[PDB]
Design a protein around this nucleic acid. Structure first.
Ligand SMILES: [Mg+2]
Ligand SMILES: [Mg+2]
Ligand SMILES: [Mg+2]
Ligand SMILES: [Mg+2]
Ligand SMILES: [Mg+2]
Ligand SMILES: [Mg+2]
Ligand SMILES: [Mg+2]
Ligand SMILES: [Mg+2]
Lengths: 208, 294, 61, 157, 169
RNA sequence: GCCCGGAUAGCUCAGUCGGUAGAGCAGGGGAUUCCGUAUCCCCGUGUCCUUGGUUCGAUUCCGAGUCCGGGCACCA
RNA sequence: UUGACUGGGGCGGUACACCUGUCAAACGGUAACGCAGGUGUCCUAAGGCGAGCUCAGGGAGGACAGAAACCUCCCGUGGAGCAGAAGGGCAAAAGCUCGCUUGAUCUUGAUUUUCAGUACGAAUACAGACCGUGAAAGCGGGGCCUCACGAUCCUUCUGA
RNA sequence: CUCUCGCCCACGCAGUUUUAUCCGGUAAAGCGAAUGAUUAGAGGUCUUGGGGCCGAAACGAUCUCAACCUAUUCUCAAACUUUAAAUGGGUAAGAAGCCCGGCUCGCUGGCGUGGAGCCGGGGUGGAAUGCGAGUGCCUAGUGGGCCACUUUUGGUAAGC
RNA sequence: GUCUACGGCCAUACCACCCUGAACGCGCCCGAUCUCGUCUGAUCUCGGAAGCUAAGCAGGGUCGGGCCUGGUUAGUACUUGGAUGGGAGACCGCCUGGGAAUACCGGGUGCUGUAGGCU
């Protein structure tokens, strides 16, 4: 396995696992949520993200080392099932290997140069989130420290941001409780199902 | 719990036409019937729209313009009691009589009355009009049955020969008139003229005198309305043939007779249907406030 | 002995060194390949207007 | 090398657009093309017979021949260092009327009726068009109120 | 009080589904013509699966559709061998039903060992006056929701005419 | 150190028609005999290498990794 | 006498004649031993025309009968099929079934595609014949379109 | 060589804009829109795949993991796409035009219809900027290129 | 105020459900002797006028679903042209011009031609 120096900056057009590639090994991450996944909405108010500064490729393998490192700190502090980490970006680009000498000039030179499927990375843009926990508000300095250790396993530059939203929902946490109170939001497990006021009227009568 | 036929089916649903959903046209046959060659540029292509319905037969002559079809003249069968056939307005003899009414009305509109008589006495044989040298040319036309199955004895070909006997040039063949033998190849004009003057329906009146008089009161009740009897019927259409040739012009009623208008609801306004909603929302909350507390 | 395969480099500035030209579309184009039944009529209409015209038009003109 | 075949790069352009499939409407066939008409080429995908070539899709030519089902069109085509007038036979469903001269045929109408409209009245209307001039020295009003002060907002993520 | 929105036997469709073609299927059509008095039409398989002995375009069954007063004449034979009791789940969600018999000797057919024993599937479709616009050529239309008939409505028909027993359990 | 076929009882080995887990030895019990030797019978012993996919169905098919044996191998 | 291309040559492969999607950077054009595949055939119907019909799949019922047998009803914008590689196209259809047929025939030019704007091949719009089919409008000179092929000289057969 | 400018408006032309008119499927965007990938929980239960349970027994009775369906959620696509730029491509911006009357035709044909051609007649100021143009013959050298922004393919990369 | 026959544009026209529908019509509807077509007068073809608005069909309704149109998203994302701009790079900011898309929210829901009929 080559250094990730080699498989970094987004140089090729994206080469997904599809019906034309058909040879690519499986990524190291295969599970993506490691906290208490069954938790409701109102249990963990704040979330905290780690956000890219630069447009690069993070490998599928490097996302495994960060989620093991971030689970390990927060079962040490917040306890087992006291948080919910979600690794948000998924590896779909397939990087390739031109495995030569396959100490001799035997195989080819650059003749049939198009590589073999080597592994998977994830193509990350500037500003896009990578990982995100959600906790109690009494765990605020354990948001940063889990996300400050897990950035020593990524290339390039990341930044830690505590988000103005209510958890993993899309709604701001200042007027979340003003809006889930009367009608406009209903909790379904770990997320929030925003209801409009423009459907059939019997499912307004199913409310109240 | 089971299955989902339409959720974004509607997002990707492509309707056919206004007139294919309603089942009138097909547009495969229309495209071949209705478009002129491009090197003719303005000459209309004429047609003969013959539509049998329940209780009527409609015959029209239209042509294709870009803003809709342009109908030249039209003959009906509720029109037909003015000339003498008062009842039985969908048989093969009311089909022939509508077509001759549709033919004579056209040539009178075009002024081609005295030339192009067609065939005055009906032998039922295949006649085919020719254009006379020095006279205005014959009215060429193309029958379209539309969406009805065209086997032999279909009465859409009843109006076809009423038009041919009026002096209209229509390409056709004798192979689909009644009286054509299927397993043989012969054609019988004697069968066809008997089918054209209404003795197929006179024999069935004779078949219902001497077999069961009780079914002859149920069926053919409105031949017993005035008096129509199976000896009178073959003469009765010949008088209808001789009277539509001398007067096809179709005068219209004075037709004013009313100033009356309201029969269906208007589309209710936005504010009326918006205040209906809150008048429902208020009526639900009193049902839970007062009627669950007291 | 490997070489260079195909370029369009330098070709755009030598196309304009004599300056790509509209072919000037003169009056009276040729009738090359007009459909023959139309053309066979149109010279029957050109060999009778030279004969059977100029007594019953020179009065009207 | 690169497959010099007819109908090659036309995955999307000989395709009916989206949710306009089916049998073609009938006013397309009820279009009247005479000699010298300026038509523009757009090959459809339902009718298979008279599609021109992908070289001409999007271009605009002139009618010199009118046939039963098609129209002879002279278009300019760009070959390498010169253009050529090519005469292409295209069926009637792949063309339509180009409106590109119809903003000139309106202002030869409303120009000549306006040319004699001042000839009978003795003026200097100057019917030749000018492009957009620099703006007139106008006089804005700020009646009562004051111009609202706006400032660049701070940065946040 | 309910005018001309009423049930009737629209058609009655019978079949025997024999496992093979040949001699055994040639006299299966001898029996279904002995019931109805009209020739059967040979239905053939479109699936070749080889665990059934079945094969594509191999004539596998005989069937007919009997309509009118002869439909209810055959139907009163097959219900008095099933003793005018059905089960509730013989009624489809579109209202129409069917029950099927074993041993066609129990029906009016006399036994002959050159022919044998065959089983029937009687299947009855119900109809109101006006259901024919779904099968009309010219202006084909949907039927309307209040005019179609339900499972819950056809079982109180079977108790009205033929006065049967639903027998749910 | 590049690819070709394998991974099955305590073992070897066949197959795992897209529908069972089966020869043959080691072990245990019987049957045979005057007592034995061979012989016969029977009962056991299957994460069918892990994970994912493909139908009232996969150990069987597909393909991802690992483990193991057999190898594509110029002239300077 | 002992092919060529070739990240030196050889071995390998064929990028040597050709077609589909992408590269290709929204007209067209565009390279590499770039990627994913395909071709040297098949078809008297799978050519032609007309008619009637609707597909894949699912739901709910029916003797054996079960995931899969046949029967029925409902839903069903193409999730089917169109000989095969793909892409495009197509529903009273270009798909299924049936009835007739041979336009897969004779003849001259023009136009398009590659292109030097040469040829072959493929194709388009006609025209003059003789025909098919359909009630007719019409459609048809091979296959729904994009590939399926071949000079001079020599030979052979046919034509007045 | 053919002509144009020598002393109220260019004939003509253009690696340009403007004014109208079409053309396209890139970037972006979308996947609670089809196709193809794909994480998570929530609600409802036909159903089978199995257990705890009254129990000789019982779809008479109480439950779970699944499974399927519903509304949501995370993340994508050179060989996907509803939508969709910027840049770009064609065309038009007049006398070779506009209008009127008439004659020819063997084509077209209800029609002194349709359309072509032909003759005679009527009135020129018809975007901005710049420029003199048109056309023919003869013809050498070249047919190893290389580089740099920007956009891109193969490659870990390369003064590849 | 609407319809019938034929149409043009082909969802503001479709879809699910629920109300209303005078008069003409359209239709369901009642029959197989003929014409014709079926395993079956169910369809298709043919004879009608005893019943019917139940359906189709037409109007209207739904805090409807789509569809159409508009805001918001947003001068955001991209992009023309320019710089001896920044940065180790990846990428970025500015200059000069052009400028989207989804969620979210708002409003609409057939328009018309020819010919004939009702009121
Ligand atoms: Mg009969
Ligand atoms: Mg018969
Ligand atoms: Mg009937
Ligand atoms: Mg009604
Ligand atoms: Mg009603
Ligand atoms: Mg409504
Ligand atoms: Mg709505
Ligand atoms: Mg720029």
């Amino acid at each position: 396995r080559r250094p990730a120096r080699c498989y970094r900056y987004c140089k090729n057009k994206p080469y997904p696992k599809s019906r034309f590639c058909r040879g690519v090994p499986d990524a190291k991450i295969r599970i993506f949520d490691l906290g208490r996944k069954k938790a409701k909405v109102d249990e963990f108010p704040l979330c905290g993200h780690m956000v890219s500064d630069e447009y690069e490729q993070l490998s599928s393998e490097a996302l495994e080392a960060a989620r093991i490192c971030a689970n390990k700190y927060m079962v040490k502090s917040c306890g087992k099932d006291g948080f919910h980490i979600r690794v948000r970006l998924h590896p779909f680009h397939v990087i390739r290997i031109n495995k030569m000498l396959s100490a001799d000039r035997l195989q080819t030179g650059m003749r049939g140069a198009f590589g073999k499927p080597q592994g998977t990375v994830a193509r990350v843009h500037i500003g896009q989130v990578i990982m995100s926990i959600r906790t109690k508000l009494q765990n605020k300095e354990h948001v940063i420290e889990a996300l400050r250790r897990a950035k020593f396993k990524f290339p390039g530059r990341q930044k830690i941001h505590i988000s103005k939203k209510w958890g993993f929902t899309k709604f701001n946490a200042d007027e979340f409780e003003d809006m889930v109170a009367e009608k406009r939001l209903i909790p379904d497990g770990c997320g929030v199902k925003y209801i409009p006021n423009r459907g059939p009227l019997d499912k307004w009568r199913a409310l109240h | 719990v089971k299955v989902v036929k339409n959720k974004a089916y509607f997002k990707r649903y492509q309707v056919k036409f206004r007139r294919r959903r309603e089942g009138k046209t097909d547009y495969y046959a229309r495209k071949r019937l209705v478009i002129q060659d491009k090197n003719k540029y303005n000459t209309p292509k004429y047609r003969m729209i013959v539509r049998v319905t329940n209780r009527d037969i409609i015959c029209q002559i239209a042509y294709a313009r870009i803003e809709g079809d342009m109908i030249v003249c039209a003959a009906y069968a509720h029109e037909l009691p003015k000339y003498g056939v008062k009842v039985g307005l969908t048989n093969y003899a009311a089909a022939y009589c509508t077509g001759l009414l549709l033919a004579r009305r056209l040539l009178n509109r075009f002024g081609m009355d005295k030339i192009y008589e067609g065939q005055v006495e009906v032998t039922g044989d295949e006649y085919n009009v020719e254009s006379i040298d020095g006279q205005p040319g014959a009215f060429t036309c193309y029958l379209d049955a539309g969406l009805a199955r065209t086997t032999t004895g279909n009465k859409v070909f009843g109006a076809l020969k009423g038009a041919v006997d009026g002096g209209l040039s229509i390409p056709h063949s004798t192979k689909r008139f009644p009286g054509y033998d299927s397993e043989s190849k012969e054609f019988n004009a004697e069968v066809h003229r008997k089918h054209i003057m209404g003795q197929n329906v006179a024999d069935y009146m004779r078949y219902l005198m001497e077999e069961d008089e009780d079914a002859y009161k149920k069926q053919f009740s409105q031949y017993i309305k005035n008096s129509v009897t199976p000896d009178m019927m073959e003469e009765m259409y010949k008088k209808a043939h001789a009277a539509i040739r001398e007067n096809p012009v179709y005068e219209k009623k004075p037709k004013k007779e009313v100033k009356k208008k309201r029969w269906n609801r208007p589309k209710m306004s936005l504010a009326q249907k918006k205040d209906r909603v809150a008048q429902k929302k208020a009526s639900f909350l009193r049902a839970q406030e007062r009627a669950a507390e007291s | 002995a490997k070489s260079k395969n195909h370029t369009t480099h330098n070709q755009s500035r030598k196309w304009h060194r004599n300056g790509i030209k509209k072919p000037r579309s003169q009056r009276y184009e040729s009738l090359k390949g007009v459909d023959p039944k139309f053309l066979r009529n149109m010279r029957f209409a050109k060999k009778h207007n030279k004969k059977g015209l100029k007594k019953m038009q020179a009065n009207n003109a | 090398t690169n497959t010099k075949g007819k109908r090659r790069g036309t995955r999307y352009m000989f395709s009916r657009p989206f949710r306009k499939h089916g049998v073609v409407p009938l006013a397309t066939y009820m279009r009247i093309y005479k000699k010298g008409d300026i038509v523009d080429i757009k090959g459809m995908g339902t009718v298979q017979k008279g599609m021109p070539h992908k070289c001409y899709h999007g271009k605009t030519g002139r009618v010199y021949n009118v046939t039963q089902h098609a129209v002879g069109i002279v278009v300019n085509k760009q070959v390498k260092g010169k253009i050529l007038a090519k005469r292409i036979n295209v069926r009637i469903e792949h063309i339509k009327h180009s409106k590109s001269r119809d903003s000139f045929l309106k202002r030869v109408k409303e120009n000549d009726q306006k040319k004699k409209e001042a000839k009978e009245k003795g003026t200097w209307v100057q019917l030749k068009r000018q492009p957009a001039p620099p703006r007139e020295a106008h006089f804005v009003r700020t009646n009562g109120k004051e111009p609202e002060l706006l400032e660049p907002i701070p940065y946040e993520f | 009080e309910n005018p001309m929105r009423e049930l009737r036997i629209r058609k009655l469709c019978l079949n025997i589904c024999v496992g093979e073609s040949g001699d055994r299927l040639t006299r299966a059509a001898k029996v279904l013509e002995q019931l109805t008095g009209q020739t059967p039409v040979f239905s053939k398989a479109r699936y070749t699966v080889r665990s059934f002995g079945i094969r594509r375009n191999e004539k596998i069954a005989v069937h007919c559709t009997v309509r009118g007063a002869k439909a209810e004449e055959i139907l009163e034979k097959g219900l008095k061998v099933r003793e005018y009791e059905l089960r509730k789940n013989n009624f489809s969600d579109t209202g129409n039903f069917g029950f099927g018999i074993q041993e066609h000797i129990d029906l009016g057919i006399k036994y002959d060992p050159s022919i044998g024993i065959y089983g029937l599937d009687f299947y009855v479709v119900l109809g109101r006056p006006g259901f024919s616009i779904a099968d009309k050529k010219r202006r084909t239309g949907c039927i309307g929701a209040k005019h179609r008939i339900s499972k819950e409505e056809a079982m109180r028909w079977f108790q009205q005419k033929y006065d049967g027993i639903i027998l749910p359990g």
